[model samples]
Target: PTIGMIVPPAAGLVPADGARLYPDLPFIASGLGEGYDAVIESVVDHARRLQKQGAAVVSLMGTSLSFYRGAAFNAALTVAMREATGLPCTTMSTAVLNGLRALGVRRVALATAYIDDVNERLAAFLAEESLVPTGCRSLDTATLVDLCVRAFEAAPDSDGILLSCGGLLTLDAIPEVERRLGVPVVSSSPAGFWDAVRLAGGGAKARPGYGRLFDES
Candidate 1:
């Protein structure tokens, strides 16, 4: 099954790069734009296009947008996408929470690369899922590329670091973060990808040493 990703419009994460990241599956990227102002519409349109092209499911990748929009707003957006396209819709934030739940993780710790406002929104988002973040840190980076580079250094100790930013690519550091914390590590992109794959009836044979979700069952 083809997996479609609704990614931000930035130089950091493009279709070519995402293709390299998950080469095992057909990865489609759309909605390369700036800011959350157009995220809902962009994701809806992206899902429509992917559905037309035979995508089983579409996952929107944006933690900051989910955090800012909150659960209710994001849920409404997902419902809208589902109705408009008749495909299951999910966001990175929902995927992260679902990944944590799949692993039986209740209390999470956060290590993000966003500013105070973004972090605050993430905190509230976690709260909505009944997952209290016991410890949290932010590198204070402003963009996805910078955050991706700095995240390797800001790894912290906790149940798991909810590396809660889609812009901050955490795929490379998943093993290191899990090794250091001695627990699970749920990054935005990987979590969403895994969830979408599972939802699309695909096996979890992609990678290893990431988290329980990869080797579940």
Candidate 2:
């Protein structure tokens, strides 16, 4: 994020990779919140605090909560984040959906670190975004490439594969996944971070071997 803050309301489960700068502002948030009534106040309050740390932009980096209620459900949250931080704001769902759009993919298979109940919401959210969730599987936070590969194997006819849950660990093994599956691979952490650059205003650049999404620019 180049000094921009990636703020999630929960902690203790995941950390983003592929960057050397920025810090998450210890929000201790999780997917259990009962919607806005659970996350709004703290996100606004801490986003204000993150603003003072000199971050040019702030992005909410939680996948489950971002679309927990429904697709684009976090629109209000983005609005609140922008109003609170006085900067452009984005969320995980927003970024990932855009990532899928850029990939020109509609039939998506999902791999997540969340349970089925949560993944169910993820699928519904994808549906609202006008995508067909061909299939889905959950993970126990495994960053292993083969593990993700096996998950994708479930939806053999998928056009693109999505790796959900920002809390799940992901590595730079995207090309292999793409090669094996014959489709673009989108992971939550990378997608969230990649889109954050554009949302924060034009520092986002794509790097090869990172993933098709990162190379989109």
Candidate 3:
């Protein structure tokens, strides 16, 4: 089974760049258009393409997409994508929840690279899932790349740091951030990628020093 990744146009990077981090699987990255202007439609379009490419499962990798809307939006997006592609679909937000559930994390801390409104929406999203955000911080940046570069230093303290925003390319820092913060550091992209791989029957194993979800039985 092949794993498919649907990234937003603003992301500017492909998941294969981090392929060595998960050496056991093959991945395909599909870039949707820019602008959070109409993310739902963009995500659905990308997911449909991945499904055409023989992707057994697809992962939508964008945190900002979830920030604008809440769980209801995510659920709607997932359902729409499934209908459009007739394949199992998951988004970064859903992946984060799955990862947290796998790790048995109840209370989480958020370290985001979004504005106040986005952060507020995220808080509400977590509350909807019965997951409490005990502590949270945001970089309040507009550009995605800038947010990613700064996240390694501005990490927060908690049982796990939910790094919001898929546009931020911080998967490389997951290990170091987890080590320094003394808690799991899960970014939107990696969590979603790993989760999709697992659900696709890829039987992928998490590398050591990655995060707790991989180690969960």
Candidate 4:
């Protein structure tokens, strides 16, 4: 099966080996556009291209690009992509939500590379989904994990942590962060892939070593 990932123009991280990540599933990513306005302009065009390429399911892979407009807009994006592609569809924001809910996470600590406006919208989006952002960091190696750790620390009582930017190499950081914080850590890229794989009918047995989101709880 093939998972189509519609990425931002500046997308920088993805599973390097989908064949290894899942025995029969390979990911094919098509670059859409950067920023909210640009992405909104080209989503259908790029989604149609992925359909032509034989995507069994399509996922839009940018968190802010999906949620900056609000929860309704994010859901609408998925609707548009599915309509345009005639395939199961998801977005990074939706993936994150699924991951968090799967982990039984309600109050969450958010870490993202967003400005206040974007962060506010994210909080609003989470609220609409009945999830709560106890805290939000609008900024990220030493930096990435540290930023997430700090965000979680700021909301120490939160049930989980959300690394909210798709471009981040979060698959590598999730385990360590979860260990330190003693809570499940969900991030964009891994959650996007996990959700896409599930939409394509692959469950826990198909997952690689991503994190709690992929592990059966």
Cα lDDT, all candidates:
0.68, 0.70, 0.70, 0.79
- Tens-digit lDDT track of model 1 for 1-217: 8776777774324334244345677766666463555776767777798788787887777777666867788788889878878988887788888888887777777767778887888888889878876665666223432433344344343355576656654565666546554577677777777777777775746555555557653
Output the lDDT of residue 176, model 4: 77
For model 4, the local distance difference test gives 0.79
Compared to the true structure, candidate 1 yields what TM-score?
0.82
- 1 or 3, which is superior by lDDT? 3
Record all residue pairs in model 1 with backbone atoms less than 3 Å apart, i.e. clashing: 9-32, 9-33
Q: What TM-score would you give candidate 3 relative to the actual structure?
A: 0.82
Q: How many backbone clashes can be found in candidate 1?
A: 2
Q: List the residue pairs that clash in candidate 4.
A: 141-144
Superposed Cα RMSD, model 1: 4.4
Ranking by lDDT: 4, 3, 2, 1
Model 4 per-residue lDDT tens digits across residues 150-200:
898788889998887776656667777877777888888777777887888
- Which structure is stronger by TM-score: 3 or 4? 4
lDDT of 3 by residue, 123-204 (tens): 8998898887766666622343343334434434345667775665565566665655556766777777777777788466
Task: List ranges where model 1 is wrong by over 4 Å.
Answer: 10-22, 34-37, 140-158
lDDT of 4 at 121: 86
What residue runs in model 2 are displaced by over 4 Å at the alpha carbon? 1-3, 9-16, 20-35, 140-143, 204-207
Q: At residue 193, give the lDDT of candidate 2.
A: 73
**Deviation from native of the Cα of residue 189 in model 4, angstroms:** 0.7
- Model 3, C-alpha of 64: deviation from truth (Å): 1.5
